[PDB]
Amino acid sequence: SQIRQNYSTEVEAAVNRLVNLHLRASYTYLSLGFFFDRDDVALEGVGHFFRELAEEKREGAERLLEFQNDRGGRALFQDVQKPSQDEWGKTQEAMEAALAMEKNLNQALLDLHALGSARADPHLCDFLESHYLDKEVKLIKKMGNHLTNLRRVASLGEYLFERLTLK
Amino acid sequence: SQIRQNYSTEVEAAVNRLVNLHLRASYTYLSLGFFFDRDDVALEGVGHFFRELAEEKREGAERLLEFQNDRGGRALFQDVQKPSQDEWGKTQEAMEAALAMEKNLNQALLDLHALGSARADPHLCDFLESHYLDKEVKLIKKMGNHLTNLRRVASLGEYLFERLTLK
Amino acid sequence: SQIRQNYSTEVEAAVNRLVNLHLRASYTYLSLGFFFDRDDVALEGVGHFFRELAEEKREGAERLLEFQNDRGGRALFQDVQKPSQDEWGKTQEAMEAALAMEKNLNQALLDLHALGSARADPHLCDFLESHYLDKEVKLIKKMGNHLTNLRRVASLGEYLFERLTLK
Amino acid sequence: SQIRQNYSTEVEAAVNRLVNLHLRASYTYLSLGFFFDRDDVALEGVGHFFRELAEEKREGAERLLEFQNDRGGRALFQDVQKPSQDEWGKTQEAMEAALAMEKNLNQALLDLHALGSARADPHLCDFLESHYLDKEVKLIKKMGNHLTNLRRVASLGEYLFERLTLK
Amino acid sequence: SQIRQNYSTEVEAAVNRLVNLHLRASYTYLSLGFFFDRDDVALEGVGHFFRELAEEKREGAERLLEFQNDRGGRALFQDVQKPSQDEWGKTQEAMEAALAMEKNLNQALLDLHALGSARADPHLCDFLESHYLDKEVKLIKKMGNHLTNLRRVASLGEYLFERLTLK
Amino acid sequence: SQIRQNYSTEVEAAVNRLVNLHLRASYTYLSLGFFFDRDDVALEGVGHFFRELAEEKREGAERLLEFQNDRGGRALFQDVQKPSQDEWGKTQEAMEAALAMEKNLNQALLDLHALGSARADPHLCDFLESHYLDKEVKLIKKMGNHLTNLRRVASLGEYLFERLTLK
């Protein structure tokens, strides 16, 4: 590749994996969003919260794909695995699943950063720091806050949280 | 389901399949878009054409998921299979692949319509007619036009098509 | 009639019946609306929800009457029967009655569509599809959502639902 | 009822009857309006005149229902009887029927006022005076004027009246 | 044709016939329009009514031609036969001829729809329903109304109708 | 005819012929326009060029019909013959056909002018000069220019001409 410079094959492969993990998260949020829009679930604010996140995760994947091309790597796509559940429970249970998913995604991003450090790829490191790491910290914090509130309000409480906190 | 009315299990399952097929098409267009953004491909208008289509297909999936919920069916998600190719060739070859994919998607939509007719589900039929069938006809026509032009211009011609028709 | 074309007497009579059924629904919603405005009921958002629906149903009747004339049929009016109840209970019970009424109305609309299909009246079919069938699906979905929430909040909860959901 | 004060059961029942009579008048005007919209009648201004009146009469019913609740009475709904005719004749004949209907409605309103006077219900009396009695006088006068003109122009004249007086 | 899908040769030929029938109607309206603009006829509103319709019919033909191309059929043009009369009589007689022509055109459109149903071409069916069938119903109704009025006013009456109804 | 003055029967008949020739040209341009909109032709600018001309020719016919009436002649309509070809070839071949058609139309207009001169009809002569003769000269010149360019660029060249001259 005429442009490639200081871009390891290890990083290139890990970028492709991290694209897939973002798409998986996005897909999970799609499922979450539509579950909460079921007539027998019917928590609009919860659905919208998750639908927003589907968009965010997909944008994260797309930005990684641009990065791949910008550095002269080759985007390689794998199946996007279906989400872990078909039904997501009450708001708290769903939010707990989302938190775990985000922590897993954050770990993957930290692992990629560590690889960039080891391979002396400061452009990769800055890319992650600037567009991913603080986003994950802020989102995880927000999810923690929501869980605390969900626990505080714990059926009427769940309605009230959707109405008054969400959106 | 308290809302369900005149909504067959056959249609419900076929809707879920058609969600998946839309997501597969979207994913294929994502791959197409990023391939044309490679430094060694570098056809911006082509990339943007396909990226637009990724969005359209995903919107089609989302609208089907809303329909599923509106009718009292259950959204069930399957893996989104990776696209058929990792590299997409010249613009004409890529466009030929997109046309074939759209014709396949259109057939699936026509098959679902035929099922709705057989099960006397006019709300389904109208939904497809109003939001899908003419979109597929118009897009397929556009792709045909583009292919004709690509053939007419057939390396310099491919550049010129990207510059002057696309974007 | 100088204008009449492809318009069966069977469809003409069924249109008149469907006008009456819309007027009956409208009248029921009038009763519902005023019940919730009683000083000893006093759920403004609930009253307004139902009053809105009275208007919608009446508009549906009027649009069918225009259709009748547009096709060269004769509007024939029957008594509008009083609603099934004089008192409507708590919000959930009232909402359950409204859902059942809408499902009955939707069935009548689907039956008329099936008759139009059998008599090869595509103008009738399109009229129903365009102005009635999706309205019934969307409204029934909304009522389902409301019922789910009403169940979730189940006296204080009923107040909160009126305040926070209705509007 | 915690609010009820100086509100006789006789007045409460008569209010309910007067709601019904307003709804009957409204329904009659609906029929009149659509008759004049028949392709073989085709007097748009006449149809619109009557359709306007359907709205007015229905509003009168709704205002009485609010009054009932405001005073602590119970709204009780009866069937809305179908109008007296299926076909309404020429404009003059239809207008004569409307005048007779309005005079009957006005008499019912005057009878209710007399009952309010007898039961010393000045709030009822003022309600009727402020929102009904002058409306009936003005409308009846207008109908008289129209009838005089219809007689003056008496087929071409009927067309001209619709064109030049109505819209 | 690279785009053609679920598009029968029977439908393709019938589309071409329906283009021709629309052009014939347009041509008839051109003749009608100019007849009423003769100094010895001189009914401007009548002329303008028909000239408008010439435009509408031609637009209908053009939209069918686009449809033909969009589906991958071949537009084939036949002579546009001269209209049935050189002189059109009084307004009522002309309007009667127009009504008969529109009913014939509507029948042709309904026949094409029935063919689309038989060949399971829902895109065709929706195209007709959305852009033709209700247009024909509304226009035919309008012509009926006009004829009723023309009969009501029946030389001075014909002048008055042009002045007061037309535009 | 009460208005007719200095208007020969020879001119009246020739006007009717020239209406027909304009309608024939318009129809030819309709065919040309839709041919270039075929998916297997797909030259939008070419299609639009011809569609514009269909409109122009039809306007020319309509203006002649007004002239006929203004002078007290009788418009008489003949069949509009189908165009000479069903398929129009490459852009250059189509443009050559259009040029020949316009030269034929221009000759017919010059012949009518010569007849007006011979019959001493200066109003006819001025009408042609003011609204037709220079239009034909300018259009024929434009077509010549286009043909020269088409020859200069002579498949890629044909694409480029559509892109850069048309649009």
Burial class of residue A12, CB neighbours in 10 A (0-12, 13-18, 19+): middle
| β partners of residue E80 | F80
DSSP B80: B
Interchain proximity E129–C123, CB inside 8 Å:
yes
Q: Are A24 and A100 in contact (CB under 8 A)?
A: no
Q: Which two tokens stand for residue A114?
A: 């560590």
Report DSSP letters for F70-100, one per residue: HHT-------BPPPS-S---SHHHHHHHHHH
Q: Helices C44-71 and C91-118: crossing angle, nearest 10°? A: 10
Question: Is C66 annotated as a binding-site member?
Answer: no
Distance of alpha carbon D164 from alpha carbon E165, whole angstroms = 11
The domain tally of chain A equals 1
Nearest neighbour of B6 by CB, restricted to C110, C128, C143: C110
CA–CA gap between residue D165 and residue D44 (Å, rounded) = 12
- Best CA proximity match to E161, nearest among D42, D88, D145, C70: D42
Extract long-range pairs of B110-113: CB within 8 Å, 24+ residues apart. B110/E5, B110/E6, B110/E120, B110/E122, B111/B14, B112/B11, B112/B14, B112/B15, B112/B18, B113/E122
Query: What's the token pair of residue D19?
Result: 């709601």
Q: For residue D61, which of A3, B133, C80 has the smallest C-alpha distance? A: C80
In chain B, what is the straight-line distance between the N-terminal and C-terminal CA atoms, in Å? 47
Give the CB-side neighbour count of residue A6, counting CA atoms within 13 A: 10
Task: Give CA angle at A52 (A49, A56), nearest 5°.
Answer: 135
3-state secondary structure of F14: helix
Task: Please tell me the distance from the alpha carbon of residue B141 to that of residue D153, in angstroms, as a whole number.
Answer: 62
E59 is in an annotated binding site: yes
Q: How many helices and strands in chain D, by DSSP H and E? A: 6, 0
Contacts of D118 (CB under 8 A, 6+ apart): none
d(CA D28, CA D85): 9
Chain F partners of B164 at a C-beta cutoff of 8 Å? 159-160, 163-164
Is the Cβ–Cβ distance between E112 and E21 less than 8 Å? no
Helix (H) or strand (E) holding B46: helix B44-71
- Comparing C-alpha atoms, which of B59, B70, B67, B53 is closest to residue B127? B67
Terminal CA-CA length for chain A: 47
**Tally of CB atoms within 10 A around C131:** 15
For residue B87, the distance in angstroms to the closest alpha carbon of chain E comes to: 23
Rounded CA separation E4/C138 (Å): 35
Burial of E9 (0-12, 13-18, 19+ CB in 10 A): exposed
SS (H, E, C) E39-95: CCCCCHHHHHHHHHHHHHHHHHHHHHHHHHHHHCCCCCCCCECCCCCCCCCCHHHHH
Do residue D75 and residue C34 have CB atoms under 8 angstroms apart? yes
Taking residue F98's Cβ as centre, other Cβ atoms within 10 Å add up to 23
Phi, psi of C2 (to 5 degrees): -65, -25
Helix (H, G, I), strand (E, B) or coil at C80: strand
Q: How many CB atoms lie within 10 A of CB A52?
A: 12
Phi, psi of A111 (to 5 degrees): -65, -40
Question: Quick one: tokens of B16?
Answer: 């879920």
Are B133 and E122 an interchain contact pair (Cβ–Cβ within 8 Å)? yes
Cα–Cα distances (Å) from B113 to A146, B117, B124, E96, F102, in that order, read 43, 6, 7, 41, 49
Q: Could you write out the DSSP letters of every residue in A46-90?
A: HHHHHHHHHHHHHHHHHHHHHHHHHHT-------BPPPS-S---S
Q: B160 and chain F: CB distance < 8 Å anywhere?
A: yes
- Cβ within 8 Å of residue C81, ≥6 positions away: C24, C27, D79
CB contact at 8 A, A19 and B27: no
List all residues 6 or more positions away from A144 whose beta carbon is below 8 Å from its beta carbon: A99
Chain C, window 60-119: residues with a beta carbon less than 8 angstroms from a chain B beta carbon: 99, 103, 106-107, 110, 113-114, 117
Give which of B17, B28, B32, B38 to mutate to test A binding, by max A Cβ within 10 Å.
B38
At D80 the three-state DSSP class reads strand
Helix, strand, coil proportions of chain A in percent (round to 5)? 75, 0, 25
Chains E+F touching (3+ CB pairs under 8 Å): yes
Residue with tokens 């006013």: E153
Q: Is F31 exposed, middle or buried (0-12, 13-18, 19+ CB in 10 A)?
A: buried
Chain B residues lying within 8 Å of E119, measured CB to CB: none
Q: Classify the C-alpha dihedral F14-F20-F24-F25 as positive or negative.
A: positive
Helix, strand, coil % in chain E, rounded to nearest 5: 75, 0, 25
- Tokens 């239009």 locate to F135
Contacts of E92 in chain C (CB under 8 A): none
Six token digits for residue E124 = 């065709």
Single out the residue of B21, B113, B130, B8 nearest to residue B65, CA to CA: B21
The single-letter DSSP state of residue A3 is T
CA distance E20 to E4: 22
User: Contact C141/B2, CB-based, under 8 Å?
Assistant: no
Tokens of C33: 């609306």
CB B128 within 8 A of CB B117: no
Show the tokens assigned to B104. Answer: 């396949």
Is residue F44 annotated as involved in ligand binding? no
The Cα–Cα gap between D28 and D51 comes to 10
Rounded distance between C-alpha atoms, residue E15 and residue E12, angstroms: 5
Do A94 and A131 form a contact (C-beta atoms < 8 A)? no
The rounded distance, in Å, linking the Cα atoms of F23 and F94 is 18
Helix (H, G, I), strand (E, B) or coil at F19: helix
Widest distance between CA atoms in chain A: 61
A102 is annotated as contributing to ligand binding: no
The answer to whether E35 and E97 are in contact (CB under 8 A) is: no
Q: Two tokens at F105?
A: 């139309």
DSSP code per residue over F3-64? T--S--HHHHHHHHHHHHHHHHHHHHHHHHHHHHTSTTT--HHHHHHHHHHHHHHHHHHHHH
Measured between beta carbons, the chain C residues lying within 8 angstroms of A163 are 164-165
Could you tell me if residue C116 is left (phi over 0), alpha (psi between -120 and 50 degrees) or otherwise beta?
alpha
Whether residue E156 contacts residue D156, with contact meaning beta carbons closer than 8 Å, is answered with: yes
Strand partners, A23: none
Residue C146 tokens read as 């409301």
Q: Which residue segment(s) compose the domain that F147 sits in?
A: 1-167
Q: Residue B72 is part of a domain; what is its CATH number?
A: 1.20.1260.10
Contacts of D76 (CB under 8 A, 6+ apart): C86, D16
Cβ-based neighbour number of residue D94 at 10 Å = 23
As given in the structure block, the two tokens for residue A43 are: 């928590």
Specify the amino acid at residue A138: K
C-alpha closest to that of C34 among C62, C59, C54 = C54
Are the C-beta atoms of E48 and E124 separated by less than 8 Å?
no
C102 is annotated as contributing to ligand binding = no
Token output for A104 = 């897993």
Residues making up chain D, counted from first to last: 167
DSSP three-state, residue B121: coil
> Whose CA is closest to B25, among B106, B145, B93?
B106
Q: Which two tokens stand for residue E19?
A: 């283009």
Q: C10 near C119, Cβ under 8 Å?
A: yes
DSSP, collapsed to helix, strand or coil, labels residue A80 as: strand
Long-range contact pairs involving B112-120 (C-beta distance under 8 Å, separation at least 24): B112/B11, B112/B14, B112/B15, B112/B18, B113/E122, B114/E120, B115/B10, B115/B11, B115/B14, B116/B11, B117/E120, B117/E122, B119/B8, B119/B10, B119/B11, B120/B6, B120/C110, B120/C114, B120/C117
Q: Using alpha carbons, select from E1, E108, E100 the residue that is nearest to residue E64.
A: E108
Per the entry, the structure determination technique was X-ray
Touching check for B142 and chain E: CB below 8 Å? no
